[PDB]
Ligand SMILES: [Cl-]
């Protein structure tokens with residue numbers, strides 16, 4: 001599924017991400033545009049060989065098991081495939097654990113590099129609140 005911007009905002013909020021560990025909603029919506037262009041199915045290899053999955057791009061080395069990444073820890077007890085669904089719950093439960101891993105949203109290179117230090121309220125401007 002490809003989400004709409006405000007559609008994803010409402011699900012992220014429902015799922016308890018608005019202000020989770022202090023990160024407001026334009027952050028998460030912003031992380032999700034640039035990690036995946038809003039697409040629950042997006043998958044991208046990393047050099048280290050790991051793969052990033054889904055609407056936030058949750059990485060198989062620590063976070064989900066894809067069976068082809070050496071040393072996987074599967075710290076969300078989950079199959080990476082299940083993060084590609086249309087039901088963002090497993091991605092948002094795991095994203096809550098990542099962000100809580102100490103470096104905050106820095107765990108997302110695209111957040112650092114492109115969201116951070118910006119007015120990330122443009123990302124929800126026009127959304128029913
Ligand atoms: Cl933080």
Ligand code: NA
Nearest residue numbers: 062072073074
């Ligand atoms: Na893993």
